[PDB]
């Protein structure tokens, strides 16, 4: 497979700078025009600049010159964007994408969420949501996980390490003053729970937090 792998979500202070990475594989790096784009949640994409990996030649959106700096490392097929003098308005998702005259922007990285804030990271409190001695009684049973009071975004939530993909609904985080809260639900056949273990996995990059919360029948 051909792939563009971006660096993790970062929280950075106003006035600081970040260096984003974009590791590539599966395609010829030298002939690649690696582009970087900015996307504010629920808005269109903004093109920042591109760099021809073959020459190191760069072309910038005049609105980002003196702000962004692109480089490339041909030996490791990795592209970098150094963004400086960050302001809270620079908080957004940043993508790297490969262009070629014969393919357009065919390859895209997964995006890196950059948060520019003076506040420190607050890891989330993860709570297992089990039904009480009263519901369930049916063919399907819904369990949940509450991911409360964290900063900044995002958090990733999987169930049984990705083994349970079906029946999952992870809700968009909601900002409460200065902290986010999110929840996820999974519906499994009663055949599955409580006989077997259902654990929700929550990862919060910015604080290097990884929690596993097993859902146990509430005896209390």
């Amino acid at each position: 497979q051909v792939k563009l792998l971006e660096s993790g979500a970062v929280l950075v202070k106003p006035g600081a700078s970040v260096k984003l990475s974009c590791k590539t594989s599966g395609f010829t790096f030298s002939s690649s025009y690696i582009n970087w784009l900015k996307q504010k949640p629920g808005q269109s994409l903004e093109w920042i600049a591109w760099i021809y990996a073959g020459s190191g030649g760069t072309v910038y959106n005049q609105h980002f010159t003196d702000k962004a700096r692109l480089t490339v490392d041909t030996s490791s097929s990795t592209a970098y964007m150094q963004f400086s003098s960050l302001t809270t308005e620079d908080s957004a998702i940043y993508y790297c994408a490969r262009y070629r005259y014969d393919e357009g922007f065919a390859y895209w990285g997964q995006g890196t969420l950059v948060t520019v804030s003076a506040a420190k990271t607050t890891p989330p409190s993860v709570y297992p949501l089990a039904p009480g001695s009263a519901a369930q009684t049916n063919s399907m049973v819904t369990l949940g996980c509450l991911v409360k009071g964290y900063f900044p975004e995002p958090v990733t939530v999987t169930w049984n390490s990705g083994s349970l993909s079906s029946g999952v609904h992870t809700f968009p985080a909601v900002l409460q003053s200065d902290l986010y809260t999110l929840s996820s639900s999974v519906t499994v056949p009663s055949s599955t729970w409580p006989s077997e273990t259902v654990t929700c996995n929550v990862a919060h990059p910015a604080s290097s937090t990884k929690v596993d919360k097993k859902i146990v029948p509430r005896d209390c």
């Binding site: 269109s44 093109w47 393919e103 209390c220």
Partner: protein
């Protein structure tokens, strides 16, 4: 900069139908116009390159046409998984620009929500807090109201609502409502009720639990 005007801004369609999205350029972009599909929590996926050229692996239902300043993306036989935002992009002039996008929504038959109420986790009570969570899953349309009642009285204070995006497989919505109380207010009451409201069901759907029972 070359401005790109997309229309319509939003479109609701029935699976099986055919639609055509318009992308206008403030000036000519030759055949340098591309189309992308973007699903939430995902990076753009190239659908059409250079106005009308197809890409290996993209469903044949997608096709584009035009040149100069008028372009069109056509989807014959829209499927459920076609939900998303569609953007056009010009690579003819610098700086490269994108359109504001067209949001494609799907039609479906009404569906009532499967409601689930969950009492506070014991771990949270120990820390002094109490969040009561209610999931209203897979319903249609998106209009749905949730109401909380503690010991029979409605409480508006402390409720956080969140909705997912339309489901790619069955075109429904889901939502979660969280009522956050202090451990003290929680221990001071017994019955906790979440009720969904929407003209579909002959009336409300209700879910409750009594703190005393464990």
């Amino acid at each position: 900069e070359l401005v790109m005007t997309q229309t319509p801004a939003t479109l609701s369609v029935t699976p099986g139908d055919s639609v055509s999205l318009s992308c206008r350029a403030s000036q000519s972009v030759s055949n340098k116009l591309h189309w992308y599909q973007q699903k939430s929590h995902e990076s753009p996926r190239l659908l059409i390159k250079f106005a009308s050229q197809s890409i290996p692996g993209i469903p044949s239902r997608f096709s584009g046409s035009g040149s100069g300043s008028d372009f069109t993306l056509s989807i014959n036989s829209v499927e459920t998984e076609d939900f998303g935002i569609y953007f056009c992009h010009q690579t003819h002039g610098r700086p490269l620009t994108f359109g504001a996008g067209t949001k494609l929504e799907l039609k479906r038959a009404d569906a009532a929500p499967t409601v689930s109420i969950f009492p506070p986790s014991s771990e949270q009570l120990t820390s002094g807090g109490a969040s009561v969570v209610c999931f209203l899953n897979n319903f249609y349309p998106k209009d749905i109201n949730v109401k909380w009642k503690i010991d029979g009285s409605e409480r508006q204070n402390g409720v956080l609502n969140s909705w997912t995006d339309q489901d790619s497989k069955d075109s429904t919505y889901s939502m979660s409502s969280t009522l956050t109380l202090t451990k003290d207010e929680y221990e001071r009451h017994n019955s906790y009720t979440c009720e969904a409201t929407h003209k579909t069901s002959t009336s409300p759907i209700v879910k409750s639990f009594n703190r005393n029972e464990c």
